[PDB]
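chain below, 658 aa
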Amino acid sequence: ISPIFQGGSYQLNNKSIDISSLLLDKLSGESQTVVMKFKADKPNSLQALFGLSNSKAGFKNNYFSIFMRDSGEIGVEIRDAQKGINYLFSRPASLWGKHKGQAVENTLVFVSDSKDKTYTMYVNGIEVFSETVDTFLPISNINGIDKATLGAVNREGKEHYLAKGSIDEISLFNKAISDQEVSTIPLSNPFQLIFQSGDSTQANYFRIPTLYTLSSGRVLSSIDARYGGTHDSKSKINIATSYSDDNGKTWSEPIFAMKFNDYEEQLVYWPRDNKLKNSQISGSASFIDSSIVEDKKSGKTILLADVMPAGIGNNNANKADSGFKEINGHYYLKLKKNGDNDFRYTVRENGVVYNETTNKPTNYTINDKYEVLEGGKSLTVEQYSVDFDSGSLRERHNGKQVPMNVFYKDSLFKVTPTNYIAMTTSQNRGESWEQFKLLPPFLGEKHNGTYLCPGQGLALKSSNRLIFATYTSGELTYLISDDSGQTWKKSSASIPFKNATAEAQMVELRDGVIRTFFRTTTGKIAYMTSRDSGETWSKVSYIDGIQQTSYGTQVSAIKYSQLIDGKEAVILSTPNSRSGRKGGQLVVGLVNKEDDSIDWKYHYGIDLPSYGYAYSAITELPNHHIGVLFEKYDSWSRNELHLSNVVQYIDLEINDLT
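prediction:
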C-alpha cells in the first residue's frame, strides 16, 4: 500500500516539530506501520523521535512514542491511563551513530498489528523485538490523542524527551506490513552480517568473532554459534566458520568447524526478563573461544577452541585435573563408566578403552569423533531439546538417537568434567573441517587445560613456526608447533596477575620479534615481547592512552603490511572506556626502529563513545583495506544479554583511520 503520510528532512535541534494537522486525521483502523530513516550522532541521554499524545492537562500518561537512548537502545511506549495500559518494549544496542566520521542513516520499521496483537521493531534490517500482548492497544486509539510530534512527546503542553538528530524520511501506513514487505525496504547500513539468526547454524546468538586472511586471498572467519542465549559455557555452543573470496563483500553460508549433537540445534528467543534471563542450558557439551592460523608449509588451516563436557564451563570445571593420565611420558584421556565412582578407564592407542584397575583392555573403542563403539558397533544416546513452554527452562529427550560421545551427559563412558583444548584442520581453506583432536596437557596431570585466546594464532613469516597463545592462572602459555600442528610444546611467560582473563593476541614486529598485547585487571592493556620466536618472553609493560574497565576486554591486533607516515605500523582494536564495553576504537601505532617502542598515533572511533563495542577481530584484507568483525554491544552488561545480530562486519581504509 501507499503511505497515508510521508515527510522528510526534519532537523531535530532540541525543539519538537508539530505534524498533527498533516497526520492525525489520516490515521485510521487499528494497525499501523511507521518507517523512519533518521540520524543521531549526538543524541541526548533519552530522546523521543516520534510521538502521538494526548497533550491535555491530566492525561500525561496517554501517549505513544518511539524513543532511543544514548546507549544505542531503541524502544516504544504505548500508554493509556483510562485503559490501564502502560506498555514499554525495547532492546539495547540497536543503533548506529557514526561510520567513517559521518552520521549513519538508520532505517527503523515499527509494525503495530491488531490482528495478531503484536508489536514488532526492526532497525537496519534486523528484528530487535517482537512482542505479543493479551490486550492490544492500537497506537492511535489512545484516549484523547491530539498531537503528532517529531523530536519530543507533548505532555500537558510541554516538550518531554527532547531529541537532537534528524529525520530524513518518515512514512506511516494504515496497515501492519508483513515481514516479507519489510525485507524489501531499502537500507543504508554501514555494516554487513557474516553470521546471523536463521542462517545454517540455527543459533539465534553469536559471540567471539575471529578473522584471518589466507594466502589465496580468501578471508576466513570463525565464531561461537551460541544457542542458549549469549551465555558462556555451560551452554550449547558450536564453532562455525564462513569465508569471503571477494575482500569481504560477500560471505559463504556458515558450516561447523566443531559441533556436538547431544542437544538439538535450536533457534530460541531467550528470555530477557530479570526472572528468567539467567536460564542456562545445563546438560549440553559445548565448544567456546576459537582461534585460527594458516600453515605455509602444509597449506592447512588450523582452528583451535576450548571444549567443555556436558554441563561444564569455566565456573565449575575441575581446576585440579587435566583429564589425562600420564603413563611413561605419554598422556591418555581418562574415562568414567556408568556406575563407577572413580575414573577407572583410559583411552589408549587406536582408541582402545582400557581398564586401569585390572590393566585389561575392554571391548570398547573410541572413534575419531570421540564416539563410543562396542565391538565395532556404534552406541547411541537420545538427544535433548530445550523449551520454555512451561514458563521455565526445560531440557528433555526428543526421541532422536545420535552417536554416543564421551563428552555427553548420557554417555556410557564420560570424560573428566574439566576444560580441554581441541584442534581441527581444513585442507580446503574452510570448505570443510576434519574431526577435532584433543591437545595434550601442557602443565601436568593435575592442572586443568589452559584457556585459548580467541582470535588468530601466529604464523611466523620467516619459518614454519606456529603459535597459539593461551592463558591460565599466573601466566600466558604459548603453544608452539614447528611441524604443521602435529606436535606442540609450551612456552610459559609469567604475568603479575592471579586468575586474570589474560586474552592475548600477537603481532610479528620484525623477523623473530613478537609483541603480544593482552587483557589485564588493571584498566590498561599490557604487552610483552619475544626476540627468539616465542622461546623466551620479556617482563610486562602497559599501554598508556587506552582505557579498559577493571575486568577488561579482549583486544585484537595486526601488523599492517604497508608503511604509515614512513613507519612500520601495528593496529589494535579494543573498546576505549573505563566504564563499560563501549567506545570502540582502532588505534594505529608506529614502531620506533631504535627500540621497538610503539607510538600510538591515531585513534579511529568505530562509532559513538557511548555505543557498545566488545570482543573484536581485525584483518588486513588482500586489497589492503581493514576488515573488522566485532560485538556491537556491551557483552559484560547484565542488561544486554541475549541480543541477536549484534556481531557485525565493517570495511575500513587506512585513510579513514588517520
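The chain has three domains: 1-190, 191-319+418-658, 320-417. The domain at 320-417 is CATH 2.40.220.10 (Intramolecular trans-sialidase; domain 3).
thats it, cya
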